[PDB]
Design a protein around this ligand. Structure first.
Ligand SMILES: [N]C1=N([C]C(=O)[N]C2=[C][C]=C(F)[C]=[C]2)[C]=[C]S1
Length: 168
């Protein structure tokens, strides 16, 4: 069976486990829990093929810099999640971008920019603005409304399509 090794990156206040738990057990949690390390695995049927998705939810802080540069060597699919309400987490993508290209040692890497809390009234970053920077890097921007569970499942398939095309 085809297994996909992905890492869940981001900052504190975006919705890390809010995406995982919502797609894994279909549950939305209001309380935020500072995660350090764990393994989330689930089987998904795409294009008639059943595959296993292994996602590692690491600390959403620049605490373990050495460890950050470690797992970044596996650039299968980077989930660039940010909060549309927090511009700081959006402009933080560049901070990771400069490192990603260094660790991956490749200019071309299939990544997906997903904005969370899109169903929330508090919006600072606009879709066009987000897409402006996204297209600057060469990555697509998707809307991920966690609370309503809209686009969360579909957006997960988009990255798989990228990985498949990056192969052959
Ligand atoms: N989770 C866990 N495991 C599995 C794996 O591998 N994962 C991953 C990899 C890489 C990346 F990047 C992300 C995720 C083992 C132990 S714990």
């Amino acid at each position: 069976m085809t297994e996909y090794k992905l890492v869940v990156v981001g900052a504190v206040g975006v919705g890390k486990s809010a995406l995982t738990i919502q797609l894994i057990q279909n549950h939305f949690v209001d309380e935020y829990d500072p995660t350090i390390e764990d393994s989330y695995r689930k089987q998904v049927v795409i294009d008639g093929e059943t595959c296993l998705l292994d996602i590692l939810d690491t600390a959403g802080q620049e605490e373990y810099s050495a460890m950050r540069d470690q797992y970044m060597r596996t650039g299968e699919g980077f989930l660039c999640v940010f909060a549309i309400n927090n511009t700081k987490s959006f402009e933080d993508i560049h901070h990771y971008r400069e490192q990603i290209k260094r660790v991956k040692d490749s200019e071309d890497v299939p990544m997906v920019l997903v904005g969370n809390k899109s169903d929330l009234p508090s919006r600072t970053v606009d879709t066009k603005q987000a897409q402006d920077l996204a297209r600057s890097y060469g990555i697509p921007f998707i809307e991920t409304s966690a609370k309503t569970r809209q686009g969360v499942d579909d957006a997960f398939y988009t990255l798989v399509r990228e990985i498949r095309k990056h192969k052959e």
